[PDB]
Amino acid sequence: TDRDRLRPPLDERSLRDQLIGAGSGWRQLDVVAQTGSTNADLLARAASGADIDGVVLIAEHQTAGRGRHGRGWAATARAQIILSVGVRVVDVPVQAWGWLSLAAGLAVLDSVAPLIAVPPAETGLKWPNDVLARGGKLAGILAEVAQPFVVLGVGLNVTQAPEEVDPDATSLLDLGVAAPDRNRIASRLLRELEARIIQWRNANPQLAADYRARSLTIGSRVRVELPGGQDVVGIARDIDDQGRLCLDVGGRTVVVSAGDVVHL
Ligand SMILES: Nc1ncnc2c1ncn2[C@H]1CC[C@@H](CNS(=O)(=O)NC(=O)CCCC[C@@H]2SC[C@@H]3NC(=O)N[C@@H]32)C1
């Protein structure tokens, strides 16, 4: 397609020089031409004994991507920022691990927000793992547990056309960013991510506060599709200390640990 001219490759050397060294917590960064799933790859490293804390894996293309709840993730080469990072979590109470996922979405949003000229309506965070812009899914986040680690995965649509991946998707290009630079965006993303991970590890109240400020879900009428197929309709009110969504259902509180949110 014509978007190929807007998709130059990543510069691995430059990313390493920016992100590895004094002042940074990232220990390793690799760019691979392609793989099945960056999340699976880092999980596999950990499963064979690797210390993956602060390890970054970026793929130009991903052929067997994973979404939440056994779903998939679609991509074409060089159209997204596709990455996974390792996070040691055993030092943090297990009940707080759900916030690491929310923190990642916040980091992704903050990394790309200033690139848009004028933010259209419905731009922000949808619980529990969506970055939305103009109602479209700009990025998806997947967290997978492999004690003592969590592997955090990010799929961010940079020039990816919705016709290539999913009808409800959007990208920076489709949001009016004419020539997005994936090298600059990747660096910004990883720096934002480091800060949010540190905040999460230290239970900094600003993490929850900043998330709330960018939430599209809180205050909205929602239908939540639960694991198992059930739907619950209510109004989202808050996120608890476990990262769970708190719903007002006719005056009753229903707290949801996992589900698919539709804003009504
Ligand atoms: N590229 C896409 N953009 C927007 N929506 C998409 C795209 N591809 C598929 N979709 C739809 C089709 C299935 C839906 C999956 N939604 S979900 O259940 O909330 N899961 C997610 O959003 C988590 C996605 C995480 C993908 C990252 S990419 C690198 C890392 N490795 C990996 O295999 N997964 C993560 C979204």
Structure description:
This protein is an alpha+beta fold. The protein has 2 domains: 1-217, Bira Bifunctional Protein, Domain 2 (BirA Bifunctional Protein, domain 2); 218-264, SH3 type barrels (Roll), CATH 2.30.30.100. Helices cover 25% and strands 32% of the residues. The chain has helices at 12-19, 38-47, 98-112, 162-165, 182-201, 205-213; strands spanning 28-35, 55-62, 65-66, 72-73, 80-88, 124-126, 130-133, 136-146, 149-157, 221-225, 231-239, 245-249, 252-256, 260-263. A 7-stranded mixed β-sheet has the order 1-2-5-9-8-7-6, sandwiched between helices. A 5-stranded antiparallel β-sheet has the order 13-12-11-10-14, with no helix packed on it. The protein has a two-stranded antiparallel ribbon with strand order 3-4. A hairpin with a 2-residue loop joins β8 (136-146) and β9. α1 packs parallel to α5 (182-201), α3 runs antiparallel to α5 and α3 (98-112) crosses α6. The longest helix is centred in the last third of the chain and has 20 residues, at 182-201. The chain is globular and about 55 Å long. Bound molecules: ligand 44K. The PDB classes it as ligase/ligase inhibitor. Keywords: biotin-protein ligase, bisubstrate inhibitor, ligase-ligase inhibitor complex. The assembly is monomeric. The entry is titled "Mycobacterium tuberculosis biotin ligase complexed with bisubstrate inhibitor 36 (N-({[(1R,3S)-3-(6-amino-9H-purin-9-yl)cyclopentyl]methyl}sulfamoyl)-5-[(3aS,4S,6aR)-2-oxohexahydro-1H-thieno[3,4-d]imidazol-4-yl]pentanamide)". The protein is Bifunctional ligase/repressor BirA.
